[PDB]
Amino acid sequence: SHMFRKLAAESFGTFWLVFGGSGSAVLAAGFPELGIGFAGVALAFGLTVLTMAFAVGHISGGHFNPAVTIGLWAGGRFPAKEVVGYVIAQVVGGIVAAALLYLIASGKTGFDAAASGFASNGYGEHSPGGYSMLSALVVELVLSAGFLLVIHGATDKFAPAGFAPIAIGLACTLIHLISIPVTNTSVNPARSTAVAIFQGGWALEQLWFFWVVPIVGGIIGGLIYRTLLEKR
Amino acid sequence: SHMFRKLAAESFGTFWLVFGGSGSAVLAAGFPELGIGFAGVALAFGLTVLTMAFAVGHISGGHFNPAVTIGLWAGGRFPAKEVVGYVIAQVVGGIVAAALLYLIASGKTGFDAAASGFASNGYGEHSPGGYSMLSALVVELVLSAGFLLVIHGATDKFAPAGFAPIAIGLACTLIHLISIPVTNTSVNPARSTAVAIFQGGWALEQLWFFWVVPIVGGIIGGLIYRTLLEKR
Amino acid sequence: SHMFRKLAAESFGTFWLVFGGSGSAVLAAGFPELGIGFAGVALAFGLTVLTMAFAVGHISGGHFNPAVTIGLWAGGRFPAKEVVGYVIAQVVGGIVAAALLYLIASGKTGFDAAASGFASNGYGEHSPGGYSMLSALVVELVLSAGFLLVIHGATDKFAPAGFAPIAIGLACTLIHLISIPVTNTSVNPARSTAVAIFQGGWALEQLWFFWVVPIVGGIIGGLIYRTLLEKR
Amino acid sequence: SHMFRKLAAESFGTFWLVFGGSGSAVLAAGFPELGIGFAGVALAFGLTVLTMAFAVGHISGGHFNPAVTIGLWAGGRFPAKEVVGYVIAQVVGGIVAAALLYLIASGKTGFDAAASGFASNGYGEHSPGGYSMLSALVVELVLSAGFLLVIHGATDKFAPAGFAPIAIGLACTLIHLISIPVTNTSVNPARSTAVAIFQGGWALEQLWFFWVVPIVGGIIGGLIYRTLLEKR
């Protein structure tokens, strides 16, 4: 319940998320004949939220995501003052994991961080299924809103205590099963930023998208729970 | 505990279910070499129930399904008066998600909502494994009954509190692992309706089946728990 | 807490298990290009235990398995008098599901219940990987023991209440991930019996094995928890 | 709460882990056309921790891992005196499972424990993806630290009671989704030791690595939770 340690929890959580989620995508998804595919990456991603929320959610609330922190503010749960420190902690944490991951990935003949996307988020060409920008937009907006509708509900007063990390993490596996072919799935501006810095080309130029669209998405989910469903 | 907000919860839950479940099937199941297959779609489907039940089950009970609402009435848990509003909320919610999904899917060269089924439920030709009508019937009846036998038991007085969304959602992954090759799996009349409206052809003509057969199925499960297992 | 209803719970649980587990194996495991494989069947199997234990475990204890009932007796948890009724309830339940399943499977051109094993358990030729009898024995004995070491521990006094259906069901997914290539996995004499009656040939002649070996296995697990780990 | 029985719990837990995790890898991962792949093995591995922690964690704490026991000491949770007995119990348990597994695997024509690695951990050639030693190091250090950051947090005073076996086991599935292509994943010095003794060649010579690197890794995670995040 001291801020220095709350920021440490958040930096570590987002770290776990970016190391785990992206590590599975770069290291294991495509491994020939025995690789884990998109369903594997979705699972890893959502177990980074669930393990860490159980571990450090009781210290920080376990946001691990700028879009979650900003949406908790929108829905009346996080004070405007603590927002910016969390976002930075998260972004920092994610950068370190993505650099550690890069050093790992390059331990193998042929690794092209650039020519493989390095699990970066993108739309259009740099969409893995080649979905246009309007497909990228509508999917992140809907999925960020929803994501926050889950965090808000799961951690509500009259939501039986203890289970929110299960609700929230699995909602993060769900969201990846849905949107990977479309954008590789962000709904986390700090996840996109980590790997974009190591794809070095096309990722960095579409980055802004995955900062604007998840956040707007998550405010909306916060607004929908706050005004519609919470009262009571 | 106001009805307007309870209907909002239900519309949103069924929305999540149709966006998630169907979105995974249309967007990710068949993606070449890395796609999530039938086991992926089953998982997504059952995480739409579990996240949303945790999130909004404490507001509405989190039915998200006409067949569940009608079966809760049969087993003595939902009053006849509130049934019709829930069913409509659910059906509406599902329609919006299925339209949003359609706009997403069409962001990609080659998308034929019609020639691909758009994850609609069907029997005979329009059964993915080509199972006859009697296979379609017996599987939905058994699986709807069972589904409701789980909801009834999991949310029973003497069922330790908190865990029903886990029981109920996973029962929804289970049911999809079983029946997808047979009918693409409905046991949800509001799920079938959402996508059927966008397959535009063969789906709409078999629709009625997936309204009659899940409901009958779910009343039966409600009746079996009510008279057999609840008393005590 | 009346016996007639406790037997109904057990018949229904074992029913769910045999319909689900085997239904996934016969209907979905091998479906070309999108099928769920051995990992899918393992999951379905273990979600039949978890949903039903949550649903009817509070009525019966949710054994769903002759080897579990007989091992609960060994470890001092189930009285010798109630054993035989449970075993029969379980076996009956399983027979009905396996017949319903058969009617479903035959709704499709080419279905050979006999030439495909119908997910029956077997050793030697009728082992899917062709493991000898000594491989069949050691795997079921170890896995039945373990299974019961989990039921005993998970439902122990000083095991925090509520979570045993998660522990026990997932132990049932685990056990299938391990042993499917070896014997298709029984550790449930009532599961083997259900489908063996519909494979009609080689299954019925190896049946006895999967009645003797799981039970011995589960008594041992009961004995190991009772004398070693419970006291205290 | 007697030591003889606490050592029995630990020997049995590590046993389950090595039988399950490795059994899935040797028996099921590569089975042609229906095998469970790396995502299957990751799941089995992490369900050995979760079932056993639920089962025997309330007796011992359910460490099942020298690196976990040594890291619990570092983070101030396990007394230095009880460390060595646990490590040996764990190592013994694991040896027995790995021998039982070997007898199982050899029940099939063609089984070469040596030419197949027998799911042993290795770096360089004997890395399944051919990742250099510096990739092996950084991945285990990060993943052991993290692993212990999860155990510490999940079992913390102010972590709602009951859920730590879910947090901890799933963190063990996560860690395998990440690192299998790189080293087959150890973060468990007692897991590596079990199978290394049966690969008989290259495993035994790289062994030391997977004793030094996980432990250092897990002390660090213990140190990071102790000094940074616990106070309060």
UniProtKB/Swiss-Prot annotation, chains A, B, C, D:
Primary location group: membrane
UniProt-annotated site: Selectivity filter, residues: F45, H176, T185, R191
The reaction(s) this protein catalyses: H2O(in) = H2O(out)
Periplasmic-side positions: 32-35, 105-132, 179-203
GO molecular function: identical protein binding; water channel activity
Protein's UniProt keywords contain Metal-binding: no
Site (Involved in tetramerization or stability of the tetramer) location in chain: S22
Span(s) of short sequence motif NPA 2: 188-190
One Gene Ontology term, aspect cellular component: plasma membrane
InterPro entries for the chain: Aquaporin-like, Aquaporin_transptr, Aquaporin_Z, MIP, MIP_CS
Record-annotated membrane-spanning stretches: 11-31, 36-56, 84-104, 133-153, 158-178, 204-224
Motif (NPA 1): 65-67
Key words of the record: Cell inner membrane, Cell membrane, Membrane, Repeat, Transmembrane, Transmembrane helix, Transport
GO terms for biological process, alphabetical: intracellular water homeostasis; response to osmotic stress; water transport
Cytoplasmic-side segments: 3-10, 57-83, 154-157, 225-232
Description of what induces expression: By extracellular hypoosmotic conditions, especially during the mid-logarithmic phase of growth.
Function: Channel that permits osmotically driven movement of water in both directions. It is involved in the osmoregulation and in the maintenance of cell turgor during volume expansion in rapidly growing cells. It mediates rapid entry or exit of water in response to abrupt changes in osmolarity.
Comment field (misc): It is a remarkably rigid tetramer that does not dissociate even when solubilized in SDS.
Family: Belongs to the MIP/aquaporin (TC 1.A.8) family.
NCBIfam families: MIP (TIGR00861), PRK05420.1 (NF003838)
Domain writeup: Aquaporins contain two tandem repeats each containing three membrane-spanning domains and a pore-forming loop with the signature motif Asn-Pro-Ala (NPA).
Protein name: Aquaporin Z
